[PDB]
Write a protein that binds this ligand. Sequence first.
Ligand SMILES: Nc1ncnc2c1ncn2[C@@H]1O[C@H](COP(=O)(O)OP(=O)(O)OP(=O)(O)O)[C@@H](O)[C@H]1O
Ligand SMILES: Nc1ncnc2c1ncn2[C@@H]1O[C@H](COP(=O)(O)OP(=O)(O)O)[C@@H](O)[C@H]1O
Lengths: 712, 82
Amino acid sequence: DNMLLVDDAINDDNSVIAINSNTMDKLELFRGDTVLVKGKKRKDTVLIVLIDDELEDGACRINRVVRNNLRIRLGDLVTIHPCPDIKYATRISVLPIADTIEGITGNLFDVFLKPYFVEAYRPVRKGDHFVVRGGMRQVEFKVVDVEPEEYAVVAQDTIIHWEGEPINREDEENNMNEVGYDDIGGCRKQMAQIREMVELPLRHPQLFKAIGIKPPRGVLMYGPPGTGKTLMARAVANETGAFFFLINGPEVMSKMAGESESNLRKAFEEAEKNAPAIIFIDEIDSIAPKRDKTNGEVERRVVSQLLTLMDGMKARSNVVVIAATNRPNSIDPALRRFGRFDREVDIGIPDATGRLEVLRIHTKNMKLADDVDLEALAAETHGYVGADIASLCSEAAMQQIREKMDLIDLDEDEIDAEVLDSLGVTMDNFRFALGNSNPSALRETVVESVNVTWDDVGGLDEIKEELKETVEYPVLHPDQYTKFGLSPSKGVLFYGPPGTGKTLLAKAVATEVSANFISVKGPELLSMWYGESESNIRDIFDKARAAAPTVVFLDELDSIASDRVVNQLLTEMDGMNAKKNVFVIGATNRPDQIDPAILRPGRLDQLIYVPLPDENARLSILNAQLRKTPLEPGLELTAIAKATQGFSGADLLYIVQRAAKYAIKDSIEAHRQDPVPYITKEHFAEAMKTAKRSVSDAELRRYEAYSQQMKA
Amino acid sequence: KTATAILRRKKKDNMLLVDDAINDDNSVIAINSNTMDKLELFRGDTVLVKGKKRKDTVLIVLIDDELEDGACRINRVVRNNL
Ligand SMILES: Nc1ncnc2c1ncn2[C@@H]1O[C@H](COP(=O)(O)OP(=O)(O)OP(=O)(O)O)[C@@H](O)[C@H]1O
Ligand SMILES: Nc1ncnc2c1ncn2[C@@H]1O[C@H](COP(=O)(O)OP(=O)(O)O)[C@@H](O)[C@H]1O
């Protein structure tokens, strides 16, 4: 409980902290000594304590400037420690800030030397910002350097130096060197995993010695481009507070031979010198790509040198290596063996909550208009990684500038601040920017989370129970299976008429067990077969393993029934270990062309027939579609359900869509000539008159015959 | 509609028109007294004239009531120079 609550202070003094005597009693502090207050992200300061009985016990009084310097807000908890090693300063060097001296010239250092340090003995520390009043201005300077270390106190005999040039303020902010856990959202699981795999070796190495194990060193995080890998690495490095050193694949690969090895050796040696340290790499694929395609000697020697350096790392050393790559399988396989990068992590596209958090983080400095509905943007935007969200915000701001430019004239070199005061980003700007966006992650197989429950599934209760017994029990009750000795099956294959609710079933299954759904359509398999596609099935299954538990989906599996892809799929699936929580769900409308090998035990052996929806199922599905669209009061869907015998979910959805389109057209005409913003009976009448069936009766008979044949 | 807002240039009273000069003066440009009155221009105070793609020059302003407001007295020499 030594931590104390941060409180707003009316006083503007930069070297006085007022606390109650009971606050000293808690730590048994003695009057007349400075105290060290440490906040977050390795931010600390030393303040002269005063007794103010007015303040209630546990309440402090620190000006806003000190809190801003510490990077903390009101109401935070800061650790307070005594100052047994209080020391005075012998030589301090400080420089001014040019933007803070605007409007007044001259040398105010001499003006501030005496009045501000007249036997004050104000404790000082590296990087502190202190504000002094000169003439008609209040100028803030920074503590460039102080001796003796580490913080010391500003004694009168201390020699003060001011020989140098002013340094910008926002330059430090944009350095990117200061980013904590707060600057990331939507990666709670991956962030926690990285923290566990990094902090423990560095913060508490004694655990591994106590338990008798060599702590892991090789951590490899991979994900879609522009997903925040570098930002997450920087954030964790700063939060740890250990020494940092970064290597860029493009940078190292851009220098002639020899120089690359020299740089790598120097980096490793320097990191070893200043342990604990973290070594980070970027685009490790570029320096160590797949050997099967790059036969050049330069990359061979570079990768060999990297391997030798990794192997030669001493047994006991607080150094952790982190690598980044878009393709998990692109890097040379030699790096993935034990004693090297083995702790693999996959980062997927953020879900709705992740998108909301990212948008909140980015939209923290722009002049957001009064009417903003970030929740709606999060709901609409799917498949957007953080980088695309930042681009969307930038484009919306650009559109706002387009709208507001008419007031000003661009020829003049100055813009009136009155216009600047009016700048604001409205919802329409975000809508337009979203309309002019271009997501790219979704075009490739990427792991994403789904949140579909059994409610969305319109019926098929028996299939629901069968699927539950098949999947959920081994995922949440493996003890029973181990006790009985029965291994869990993994190969499930749905077959039936198209548009009967298969993908939604797979999503629901993935949601129930809280697993990362993976989608792989038949065209993707065909492209992989022809080689045009980048990722291969091996990559898909490696990502599935790294993201376990997972549910992989194979749509139109008959579209590849080609034999090489089938053979590779069989090999990868059989190689999978059953104990791992990995499941494959195949779908096909023609369960006859599939090669017999796929149906062997230990593979896609479970066969599930998907029948057409029943009247109750049709009614439930229609209700599910009609959740946001207002309906004519008294509208009855039972007649529609009864008149739609043999229909499929897709056909019912299209019926709803055409009815909505007719209602919209009627509204347009009425408005041109919104009193009627909903649908009425006539639209449904037209829709049902324009009804049909996507499946012929012959196909239904064939499906029934095949299902009965499989039963017998 | 508005996407091309940047391209269009705002209008202002100080911009003027180009016409051939009756006189042969080179460094001296004459404008109507009303145009000076709108901008409160006086006699003896040199004028910075900016043309196209940053071309600029300094001329001597004179009172010429005869001329249409916003119409200038500049010959082929000054036109080439600008
Ligand atoms: N939570 C977040 N997740 C992802 N990107 C984020 C997040 N918050 C901000 N960003 C933005 O995303 C970019 C940071 O990710 P970055 O572009 O470094 O990822 P990357 O593609 O893994 O990088 P690298 O160049 O190292 O391969 C910056 O634009 C940052 O503003
Ligand atoms: N139980 C259900 N049976 C059939 N369709 C359903 C069911 N529940 C919902 N639907 C709807 O079926 C439509 C088609 O879903 P989709 O996954 O494309 O089907 P398929 O995988 O058969 O092509 C979706 O709009 C979905 O809302």
